Amino acid sequence: WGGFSVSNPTIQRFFALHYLVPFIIAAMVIMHLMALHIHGSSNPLGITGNLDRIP
Amino acid sequence: AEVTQLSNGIVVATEHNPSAHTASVGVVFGSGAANENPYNNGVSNLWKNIFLSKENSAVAAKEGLALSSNISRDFQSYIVSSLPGSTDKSLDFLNQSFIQQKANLLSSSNFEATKKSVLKQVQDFEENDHPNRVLEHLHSTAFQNTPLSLPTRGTLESLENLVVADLESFANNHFLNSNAVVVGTGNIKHEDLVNSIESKNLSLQTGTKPVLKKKAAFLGSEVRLRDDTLPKAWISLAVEGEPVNSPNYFVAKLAAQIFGSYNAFEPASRLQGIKLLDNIQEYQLCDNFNHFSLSYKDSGLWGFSTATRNVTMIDDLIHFTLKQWNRLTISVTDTEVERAKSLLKLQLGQLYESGNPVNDANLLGAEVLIKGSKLSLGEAFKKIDAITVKDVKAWAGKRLWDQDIAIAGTGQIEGLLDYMRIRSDMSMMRW
Numbered sequence: 001w002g003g004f005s006v007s008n009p010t011i012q013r014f015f016a017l018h019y020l021v022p023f024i025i026a027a028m029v030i031m032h033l034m035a036l037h038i039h040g041s042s043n044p045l046g047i048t049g050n051l052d053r054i055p
Numbered sequence: 056a057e058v059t060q061l062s063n064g065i066v067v068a069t070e071h072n073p074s075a076h077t078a079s080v081g082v083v084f085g086s087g088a089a090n091e092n093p094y095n096n097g098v099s100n101l102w103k104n105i106f107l108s109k110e111n112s113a114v115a116a117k118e119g120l121a122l123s124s125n126i127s128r129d130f131q132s133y134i135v136s137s138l139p140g141s142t143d144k145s146l147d148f149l150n151q152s153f154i155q156q157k158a159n160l161l162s163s164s165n166f167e168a169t170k171k172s173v174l175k176q177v178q179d180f181e182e183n184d185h186p187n188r189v190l191e192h193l194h195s196t197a198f199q200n201t202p203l204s205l206p207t208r209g210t211l212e213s214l215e216n217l218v219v220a221d222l223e224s225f226a227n228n229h230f231l232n233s234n235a236v237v238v239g240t241g242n243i244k245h246e247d248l249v250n251s252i253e254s255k256n257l258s259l260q261t262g263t264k265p266v267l268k269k270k271a272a273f274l275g276s277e278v279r280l281r282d283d284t285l286p287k288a289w290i291s292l293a294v295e296g297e298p299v300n301s302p303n304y305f306v307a308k309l310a311a312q313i314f315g316s317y318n319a320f321e322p323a324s325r326l327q328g329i330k331l332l333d334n335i336q337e338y339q340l341c342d343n344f345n346h347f348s349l350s351y352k353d354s355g356l357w358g359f360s361t362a363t364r365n366v367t368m369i370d371d372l373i374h375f376t377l378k379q380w381n382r383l384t385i386s387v388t389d390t391e392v393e394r395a396k397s398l399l400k401l402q403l404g405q406l407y408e409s410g411n412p413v414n415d416a417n418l419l420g421a422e423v424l425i426k427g428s429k430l431s432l433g434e435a436f437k438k439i440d441a442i443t444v445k446d447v448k449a450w451a452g453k454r455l456w457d458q459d460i461a462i463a464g465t466g467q468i469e470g471l472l473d474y475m476r477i478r479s480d481m482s483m484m485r486w
């Protein structure tokens with residue numbers, strides 16, 4: 001809170017943390033795409049896809 | 056070259072050469088593999104091996120005569136060779152196997168021995184000759200459901216159903232007087248050939264070849280024959296080209312000479328004046344390539360073939376080649392046209408002036424069947440010398456810029472991409 005209730009310090013620190021966390025999400029999206037690249041996507045049949053690929 | 060029609064309707068053509076030590080006499084017919092249907096495909100390949108059978112070749116060898124035969128898509132030939140002074144002996148042999156007596160070659164003992172020999176050749180061709188069976192699959196996917204897609208050797212499934220009554224039916228419709236040209240090359244003069252033919256009176260009935268229903272048409276398509284147990288990848292790719300009797304016949308031949316042939320293991324072929332060789336020699340993208348321009352009676356093909364072991368960089372070899380074809384429309388230079396003029400005159404000077412009278416008899420007879428005469432080599436050289444840079448850019452903007460292609464491939468061709476990323480390289484996005 002920065003005090004005894006939800007007050008002026010609570011709102012001023014909630015806005016500064018709101019500016020920052022979308023940039024942490026953007027860094028975790030890059031780490032998400034790096035793990036996707038080493039194995040590729042799945043397919044709705046659940047079997048291997050290495051026999052028939054298109055770019 | 057002298058052409059003369061006789062009183063009974065036989066066309067005689069002769070190219071005399073007094074500095075040759077042999078002579079060749081033969082008959083060329085104007086029906087090939089493109090005059091069959093999918094059921095009797097292979098009857099021309101069977102008629103060739105009946106002519107070259109052992110009991111026929113033993114009769115000719117006692118007189119000092121040699122036999123040859125050639126099956127193509129538009130013509131067939133049956134040629135006898137001898138010494139210059141035995142030319143009436145080779146006319147009597149050709150008389151007794153096409154006119155007066157043909158039922159002794161089609162006996163049941165000779166037919167079944169010949170049929171199992173041809174079945175062994177086509178089976179060996181399909182499993183061992185990979186650059187040549189890819190080019191035959193390119194004809195069958197570019198001209199599909201049209202007479203120009205049948206293979207000249209026949210297929211293995213169609214050859215096993217042929218009997219002796221199929222060969223007699225094909226001969227009665229196509230081996231006619233109005234479909235034939237009698238040729239002669241080497242040390243033989245025109246008047247002794249005409250007087251020797253006129254001495255035997257030769258009734259020679261007045262039939263006419265059957266006409267085809269379907270006209271040949273090009274279709275953009277592809278066929279893939281993947282085989283991961285083979286060491287290389289073999290690919291052919293083409294657009295629709297020029298027929299015989301086209302006004303752009305020599306312009307299409309000069310455009311293929313600009314890109315030419317290549318062998319990666321010959322030191323002098325790596326030094327040629329071709330701008331494509333700068334791109335492909337850095338990472339060694341291929342083993343060999345060659346550019347062609349094939350022309351038939353109805354249509355044609357223009358493209359290239361290749362073979363490589365760099366199976367992980369196939370998409371760079373196709374991309375670099377098609378980006379050089381784009382330059383014929385926008386930015387082809389003057390030195391490239393003058394270099395290709397000199398190399399084209401050397402190429403077809405070695406084709407029409409070899410020392411083989413069997414090769415000259417095939418080229419002479421195939422041309423009189425289509426045009427009625429033969430163009431001289433001196434007049435073909437003046438047509439090549441009058442081609443400009445504007446003639447090349449006008450031809451390539453009509454035939455190559457943003458056009459449909461046909462692809463065929465075998466071997467380790469996993470790295471060859473889809474139709475639509477190869478089709479989109481036929482324009483540049485720049486202009």
Ligand code: HEM
Nearest residue numbers: 025026028029030032033035036037039040041042043044
């Ligand atoms: C901002 C958030 C996210 C972004 C930009 C994102 C992006 C992507 C992309 C582009 C793919 C590629 C293949 C596809 O579209 O299926 C993918 C796959 C995948 N994502 Fe996400 N994703 C996000 C959130 C999530 C969440 C919340 C989960 C799970 C709790 C998740 C789990 C997965 C999985 C398991 C796959 C693989 C699916 C497959 O290959 O069948 N992702 N993601």
